[PDB]
């Protein structure tokens, strides 16, 4: 997974249709994730990228996974609209989310202690 | 527009949707398909307010934007002489750790 | 076509078959009432709300709300049912 160094510019608008502070993540030419500055919820940002580049986005406080035009966004030839939405999380993950966010890293099974500690991670999702 | 409702009575709670254009009486028809009781033995409420068979759910304040999938509006159900409106509350959560 | 999901405290939640079948656990417990000995009604109403929310949105999606006091229990419920 790496941006394709096309040098063909590509005009993109980062539209934030989620109640989360979005963190855009560009996958540079070696596949490493590069963090761009964040979009408050409901705010947009016209941005300059290139055909064949690799973008993903996360909640920027918890790294929860968001959708862009419903997982990986590649600017194609022209501007282009990257619509960043909440996914329909599982009920389990959604509860992991709420719990995570109210307790610093309790009365639940041992298998759930691990789930709560298996934070969403960008390096993690990438291998997938 | 679809409205999402919990229809509630005693310890019974149906989750269903209807159109905002559809009628109280038409909702009573839905109850009949489920709880097998004909509409004339049914009364429908929005809070304490008896609802009229002819009025639309929207008129009655069940709007697509208030009656939501993840947060559905409540419609009181009374059976029949007619009982009073009774809805048993849900259990109460423990205290926060 | 509907099913009855009964909570630990007697409350009887009647929801469309297809909504309940989302849960793989419930599909087994139907193969049509299902009794939930460890799930109280304030947890099982949320589960039912989640079914509707999940079926409608699977535009822009809204956050599924979860109050703090019900968060732990709902987590166990979600964990058991896999929903």
Author numbering:
A (entry chain C): 63 to 132, 134 to 141, 146 to 172, 178 to 200
B (entry chain A): 1 to 80, 84 to 100
C (entry chain B): 17 to 47, 58 to 84, 88 to 112
Paper text:
The VHL-containing cullin-RING E3 ubiquitin ligase (CRL2VHL) complex is an E3 ligase commonly used in targeted protein degradation (TPD). Two cullin-RING family E3 ubiquitin ligases (CRLs), CRL2VHL and CRL4CRBN, are commonly used in TPD technology. These CRLs are members of the multisubunit RING ubiquitin E3 ligases with a cereblon (CRBN, substrate receptor subunit)–DNA damage-binding protein 1 (DDB1, adaptor subunit) and von Hippel–Lindau tumor suppressor (VHL, substrate receptor subunit)–Elongin B (ELOB, adaptor subunit)–Elongin C (ELOC, adaptor subunit) (VBC) as the substrate receptor–adaptor components. In addition, ELOBC is an adaptor subunit of CRL2/5 E3 ligases, bridging a substrate receptor subunit (e.g., VHL or SOCS proteins) and cullin proteins (CUL2 or CUL5).
To determine the crystal structures of VBC in complexes with coumarin derivative compounds, we attempted co-crystallization and soaking with each of the 25 compounds (2–5 mM of 25 purchasable coumarin derivatives). Successful results were obtained using soaking for 7HC_1(DE22) and 7HC_5(D3), and co-crystallization for 7HC_2(D7). Three 7HC derivative-bound VBC structures were determined and refined at resolutions of 2.60, 2.46, and 3.00 Å. Similar to the previously reported VBC structures, four VBC complex molecules existed in the asymmetric unit of the crystal. The 7HC_1(DE22) molecule was modeled in three chains (B, H, and K), VBC−7HC_2(D7) was modeled in all four chains (B, E, H, and K), and 7HC_5(D3) was modeled in only one chain (the K chain). Our molecules bound to the previously reported “ELOC site”, to which some small molecules and cullin-2 (CUL2)-derived peptides can bind. The 2-oxo group of each 7HC derivative formed a polar interaction with the main-chain carbonyl group of Glu102, and the 7-hydroxy group also interacted with the side chain of Glu64. When we superimposed our three 7HC structures with the VBC−MB235 complex structures, the ligand-binding sites were identical. A structural comparison of ligand-free and ligand-bound ELOC showed that the hydrophobic pocket structure was nearly identical. These results show that ligand recognition is likely due to conformational selection, rather than an induced fit.
